[PDB]
Every structure is written in C-alpha cells, then in structure tokens.
Amino acid sequence: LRPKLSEEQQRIIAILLDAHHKTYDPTYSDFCQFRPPVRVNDGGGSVTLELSQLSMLPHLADLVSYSIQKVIGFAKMIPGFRDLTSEDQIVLLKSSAIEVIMLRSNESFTMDDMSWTCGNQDYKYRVSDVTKAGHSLELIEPLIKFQVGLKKLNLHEEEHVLLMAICIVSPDRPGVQDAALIEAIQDRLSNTLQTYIRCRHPPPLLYAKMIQKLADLRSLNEEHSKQYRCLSFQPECSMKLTPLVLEVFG
Template structure:
C-alpha cells in the first residue's frame, strides 16, 4: 500500500521469474535433481526444462543456482525474506519511487541479517552468499528473457503462450 500501483506492477513483472526460481528451490531435490510439485507422482527433472524449449545456456546456470542455494540449507523464513528482498529491488525497470523501495528493501535486509545472527551462529558469510544468489538470479532472468523472446517468435510455441505469460514476460521487461 506504500507504493503506487505502477511501481507495484513494475516490481512484480520484472521480478516474477526470479521469484519463481527462488520459490522453486524449496521443492528442489539434490538427490535426483528434480522439483517436486505436490508429491512423488508430480516431479519435474532437469530434462523437462529443455522439453519446455529452454537451452543449456539457461539450464546449466539454473541447475548450478538451484544446487548452490539448496546447499545453503535455508529456513523457510530465510527463503521468504530473500524473495521479498528480490521483489523490492529499486533498480527494476519502470520503477518511479526508488528511494521508498530501497528503504523497504533495507528493512527486509536488516530483518534477514538479524534472523541469521539468531539462527545461524557462526554463519557470518551466509548473508553475503544469499545476496550473491540474487545477483546470480539477475543473470538467469536475462537469459530466460532472451530465450522467451526467441520462443515467442517460433510459431509452434507462440500459440501456446497465454495472455498472462505474454504480459509478464513481454519484451518490454527483461
């Protein structure tokens, strides 16, 4: 409520894939390199990502990201705070009130650091590693956008894209 509708939309659209990648880490398994979607019968493996039209330029860094983030053994609270910090990035395209968004992000960063101090004594580098993962996400977002634009120009795929997907991952947002 503290942000304009325009800023809220800009933040949501430009961070959507990053939030999805962060959220999916909670269901990612290091054992079989798959994502569980509600139960053992609904799993997606790494090869399923290529079947969706993505190439190794996205897949390899995505798996590296998922493995690295999973190995941090984050608590659910840390995942949620990291997603919120990711969402409230003042440098997103289309954002107007950079100062307010930065202020909100700083509050979340302080909360995350406090949580880490209490729940991970001796985890001095954990916060830095988590923030590095946000930088990795930006690169993944760029590659995803590039591949999405490539897919959207292929007739066999473009008919399958829903209006919501077109709106969120449209060419004006990268």
C-alpha cells in the first residue's frame, strides 16, 4: 500500500525544508571568517609531523564549530524537539553533533574527485586535510566510504532533512531521560520519511539503505570520539579548538 502524506506530514516536511534553508548556506560564504587553512609538506602523512603542527586544525575546528551552531538552530525547528526537556535537547545535540556534521557535509562532497568542494581551492577539502588536523586512516577510510554511499542514494532534499532530524531525535543515546517521548517524535519523523519514499521517490529499499546509513554514523561517531581523545592529549591543542568544540566533544 502507498498511503498519501497526511496534512501534518506535509507540514512537517515544509517545516524541515524551511529550517534547512535558513541554516545551510550552499555558497559557503562565511568560510573566509574562519581561521585560515594551512597546508604544510606531508606527502608521507607522518603522524608525528601532523601532531606537531595540526596545521588544518584551527580552520576545521572553526568549520565544525560553525556547523554545530547551524545544527543547534535546525534542531530547534524540528517538530516536537521543543517539547523535550532542555536537558534531553542538549544530550541529543551533543551525542549526534559529529554524525549530523557528516550528513550535512555530503551536500558539498563531490564524487568528481572525492573532495568536499566549498568554493575556491582554499576551501577544497580532501582526506589529506583531515590527516593534517590530526586524524588517522581508521576514521578517514570509512568516512570517505560513507560520503560516497550516501551521495549515491541521490536523496531528495526532503529525505536529507528528514534523515538529519531522525539522527538528532534518537531515543537510544546515552544519558537521555524521556526515551519514550524522544521515540514518539522520531517515529512521527520516520513514518513521514517512509510514506514520502513510497509516495514521491520514483524507481529504481531506500528506507532500509537510509537506516543503514544511521548505523554507519554510529560507528563513525565512536571512532571520531577515540580520535578526538588522542588529539586532546596534544599539548596546547585547546587553543586550536573552540569553546563549543571543547564542550561538545570533551
């Protein structure tokens, strides 16, 4: 059966699309305001050298911090998100931050050269830039695999916004209080998405593929958390980060 989207489901989709349009700049026009990218000689991808310099860390920390601010703004517009306690809203934001950043980075990701192209050559990011921020291949290899698999789904904007909202409103995050209310908000979003796909997505298992991307995000989140811990041991690393990054990942 292919039930039609309800008036409420149409309203939810319109709300999420508007929220995304207000919180995502597809021209990357604020990027010149971040601390500048610095790319030094590291053809060998030396862990010792990367940790010694962390040349791309100030720029990428400013990028992630900016992205987290946008995610906070988007989440506030998710129907039902405001119905949660302020404590649950924060737990959900902090626990999903890196996964939602990964999902939103997909819009600038291009399979032309496997880079995140955000304007000029200064704002063109590759695997090499992430290693220059002190990350290792255990995170980068699955991260690129994820970006390509997600890109190949050719998601409609409606599906992309629902996916981010479902990611944020997850009842299975550690420390949440009202898991049942979080689950009812997520179910309302998940049903909207399932109905949308059957009703609007032409042929040529998309919902199952999108669910699998959410599980892939969980693994990437865990690996990112391990790597952030290593990075946090580097003397003077805090100056290269931001207060928001320090709170979210600390």
